[model samples]
Target: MFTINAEVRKEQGKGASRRLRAANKFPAIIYGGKEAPLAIELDHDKVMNMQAKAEFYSEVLTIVVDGKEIKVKAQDVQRHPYKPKLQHIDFVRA
Candidate 1:
């Protein structure tokens, strides 16, 4: 089975986010619709790999946990100006 993994965030802002950026980890959140937003940091690598693909934007995003999914879309992406690194991402529920 496959999954998109994340941990609950009690802290907020670029202060903590930069910490994760120092490593191969970064922050991400899912918002909109009826539920409260969920904030989590994910392992890197695939993030850089996936963003290069067209489907990463147009495709319906799913929050995978133990092989299940959600209907969502990529809302916004914040990337470095000169590098392949992406800084932030937001998803709107579809």
Candidate 2:
């Protein structure tokens, strides 16, 4: 229902991802469909808002990252006890 914008993250790893979450953002990835896997961060508020939509997780999304459109199906592994937020989202080309 929306075209979310993303920024390619320079560094990668747990720390980098954690650091990003310290701000109003979180790490994310996109792979397959014809190129190397890409790492990026998204707008946290917007992301959470999208989660309110029932099909946000399953839908093959169109994201605008850095200046282009990317078609990706979302993947995730959530930690339920402490933080109720999405740990991360790994999107694969659908």
Candidate 3:
């Protein structure tokens, strides 16, 4: 299993989320279960590595942040229309 560290993002909206691309941080959302949704950011390179494997797209993945391990499934992923780049990811509790 692959593990990655994610961080909470304070910004929202298209403009703010778009701003992250320049900093190499991809926007992502984690929702589902009884907990409220979380807005977070993932490293571009690390996400790319995970995306390279089929398991990442099909299986539950672990995200550790703030000393917590969260089991989540990639519910949705928005990718570039033409380029091989990831735009956003939507995750749900596994």
Candidate 4:
């Protein structure tokens, strides 16, 4: 299984998200299935590499959070309007 490490986010808002991005991280959320939606952040390099690959959207991903793993499918990704940057990502439980 392809896995990525993530950190749980405590704050939610445009300001908080902006701050995360400023520090070179990508803000993301995982929803659906029986679990509650999880707010998380991913490494910028990982996100960029996933964006460049065609299989990312089609394949399932394992996201590690707090020593546990969650299986998710990439649902949507919001990118920068002007720059080649990732803004946010939406994932759903598989």
Candidate 5:
């Protein structure tokens, strides 16, 4: 499996994340054992391609952030960044 780096986001409000998406970013939340749910920003187009690929969610993924690495299984995914579309991604430490 390939790995991707996700940038940490300090913005906590939904509106802020929405604005970020408007600026061509995607808001994400990473949660796992010994790790807090980290607010992150991922590239929109790249991630969309990932979403389109096979085994995008079923396969294990390594999300690296701030020099830390987390192995997780993507349970659900939300493709839309706005428009009330909730991509419920459920992941756990592997």
Candidate 6:
């Protein structure tokens, strides 16, 4: 299992996140069962590299951030409308 880190973010709205992306890295979010959605960002290239690995996309992940742990599995990946790149990704609790 690959380990990844995530930080709970507070940004909301597509425009806000779109702006954040210009200065930030990858835009991401975590939501599951009874947990409220947690918006977050990570190294775009880092996550992209991981995504290139077929094994990474089809397995459980152990996410750690601020010392808290969460179990997750990759779900959907949204791509740029025309840039031929990733726009966002979705993950679910395992």
Candidate 2: C-alpha RMSD after superposition = 4.9
In model 4, how many backbone clashes occur?
0
The candidate 2 region of ten consecutive residues with least summed lDDT is 75-84
Each candidate's TM vs. the true structure? 0.62, 0.68, 0.72, 0.70, 0.63, 0.66
Best by TM-score: 3
Report residue 89 deviation for candidate 5 (angstroms).
4.5
Candidate 6 structure, TM-score to reference: 0.66
> How does candidate 4 fare on TM-score?
0.70
lDDT of 5 by residue, 13-76 (tens): 6544545545556567776657577777665555555555436667777777666777777655
Better of 2 and 3 by lDDT: 3
Candidate 4 residue 88 C-alpha distance from true site, Å: 0.8
- Model 3, which residues run further than 4 Å from truth? 10-19, 79-83
Off by over 4 Å in 4: 10-21, 33-35, 79-83
Q: Give me the overall lDDT of model 1.
A: 0.59
Cα displacement (Å) at residue 92, model 1:
1.5
Cα RMSD for predicted model 5: 5.1
Clashes of 6: 0
lDDT of 3 by residue, 7-88 (tens): 6664345434565646677767888778788887777766677766446757668777556687887677664433457767
User: Which 10 residues in a row give candidate 4 its minimum summed lDDT?
Assistant: 10-19
Overall local distance difference test of candidate 2 = 0.65
Clashing pairs in 3: none
The C-alpha stretches of model 5 lying farther than 4 A from their native spots are 10-19, 33-35, 80-91
